[PDB]
Design an enzyme around this catalytic site. Structure first.
Site, mmCIF file in Angstrom:
data_model
loop_
_atom_site.group_PDB
_atom_site.id
_atom_site.type_symbol
_atom_site.label_atom_id
_atom_site.label_comp_id
_atom_site.label_asym_id
_atom_site.label_seq_id
_atom_site.Cartn_x
_atom_site.Cartn_y
_atom_site.Cartn_z
ATOM 1 N N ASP B 34 80.249 48.696 44.043
ATOM 2 C CA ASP B 34 80.827 47.381 44.231
ATOM 3 C C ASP B 34 80.176 46.502 45.308
ATOM 4 O O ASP B 34 80.231 46.815 46.503
ATOM 5 C CB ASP B 34 82.319 47.580 44.513
ATOM 6 C CG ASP B 34 83.048 46.290 44.769
ATOM 7 O OD1 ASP B 34 82.608 45.222 44.282
ATOM 8 O OD2 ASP B 34 84.089 46.363 45.452
ATOM 9 N N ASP B 214 79.091 39.457 41.844
ATOM 10 C CA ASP B 214 79.920 40.629 42.114
ATOM 11 C C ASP B 214 79.923 41.720 41.028
ATOM 12 O O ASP B 214 80.498 41.541 39.958
ATOM 13 C CB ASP B 214 81.353 40.142 42.385
ATOM 14 C CG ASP B 214 82.326 41.270 42.613
ATOM 15 O OD1 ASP B 214 82.027 42.168 43.413
ATOM 16 O OD2 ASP B 214 83.399 41.253 42.005
#
Lengths: 8, 329
Positions: B34, B214
């Site tokens: 992430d 992201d």
């Protein structure tokens, strides 16, 4: 909830 | 080759994973890599909640290198919360190792039903220090100072379901992954991998929009107001109460996202955010777009975007590079 592992 | 490569596999199209190990004995875990967070946690054998019953558990008593910390920490994500305590041990990503400060998660109740449903053990943040908890330097940054990688940057070449696998590449930009020029965009903060672009979806325009590249988001996020307008006459229904948007895959009115800077123009055609769902209806598709409001207009350029565009996350240059990804290696 929208699948997002952004953190706040 | 002279860089650290972690293989990425994409099963269902909800979220892809990567592997890495914690502990001197190479305890294995499946991670969500992430870029939207800055901590690395694994479910502990101290975990008392049910989500852990089917996950890979870290047992500090089996690793020579373990080093107790114990201070309590909580993690809040857009999708959930997990809690546990910090610990210190040898983390191994790819073919590099290093002592690192991580979180042993013992409470997952605030991350359901997602956690039990999904099939990953933990998360591995790839963001900036300020964003982290417990002032922890990013893995890639530490690896660089320690003279373990060429540059303090990492790239993502996302996998595509049932087509080709992907790669997380630490310390180097490998041209094998893209084509055309690589256009760099400056960050406006060393918190998130956030840059500024103009968002022109159809006839709707957001000048100087806040954009977050992201890997931890499966969809393309948009400010609710903007989503509503954007879709105002494109024959696209919104499920009465259910937060989804179903439409015909062939719908000729499906828009194409267009974000622009001085240095580049990035587009995201329908073929990148449409999810066939024949099951529900022959010819039907769900849009992989969702509303999410920030105090300042912001978009989250999620997986659908990074799946078309090879991306470079460069700490040394506090910028994000974008290049069209090779459709196949």
């Amino acid at each position: 909830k929208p699948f997002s592992x952004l953190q706040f | 080759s002279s860089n650290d490569n972690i293989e990425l596999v994409d099963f269902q199209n909800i979220m892809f994973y990567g592997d890495a190990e914690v502990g001197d004995n190479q305890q294995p875990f499946t991670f969500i890599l992430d870029t939207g967070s800055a901590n690395l946690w694994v479910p502990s054998v101290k975990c008392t909640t049910a989500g852990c019953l089917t996950k890979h558990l870290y047992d500090s008593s089996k690793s020579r290198t373990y080093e107790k910390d114990g201070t309590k920490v909580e993690m809040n994500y857009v999708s959930g919360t997990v809690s546990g305590f910090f610990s210190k041990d040898l983390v191994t990503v790819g073919n590099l190792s290093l002592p690192y400060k991580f979180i042993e998660v013992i409470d997952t109740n605030g991350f359901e039903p997602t956690y039990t449903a999904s099939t990953f053990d933990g998360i591995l943040g790839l963001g900036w220090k300020d964003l982290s908890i417990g002032s922890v330097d990013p893995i890639v940054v530490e690896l660089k100072n320690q003279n373990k990688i060429e540059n303090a940057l990492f790239t993502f070449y996302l996998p595509v379901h049932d087509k080709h696998t992907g790669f997380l590449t630490i310390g180097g930009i490998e041209e094998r992954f893209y084509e055309g020029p690589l256009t760099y965009e400056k960050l406006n903060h060393d918190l998130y991998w956030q840059i500024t672009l103009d968002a022109h979806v159809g006839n709707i325009m957001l000048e100087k929009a806040n954009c977050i590249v992201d890997s931890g988001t499966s969809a393309i996020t948009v400010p609710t107001d903007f989503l509503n307008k954007m879709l105002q006459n494109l024959d696209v229904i919104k499920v009465p109460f259910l937060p989804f948007y179903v439409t015909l895959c062939n719908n000729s009115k499906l828009p194409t996202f267009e974000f622009t800077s001085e240095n580049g123009k990035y587009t995201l055609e329908p073929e990148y955010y449409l999810q066939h769902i024949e099951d529900v209806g022959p010819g039907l598709c769900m849009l992989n777009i969702i509303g999410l409001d920030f105090p300042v207009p912001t978009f989250i350029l999620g997986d659908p975007f990074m799946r078309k565009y090879f991306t470079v996350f460069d700490y040394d240059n506090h910028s994000v590079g974008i290049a069209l990804a090779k459709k196949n290696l």
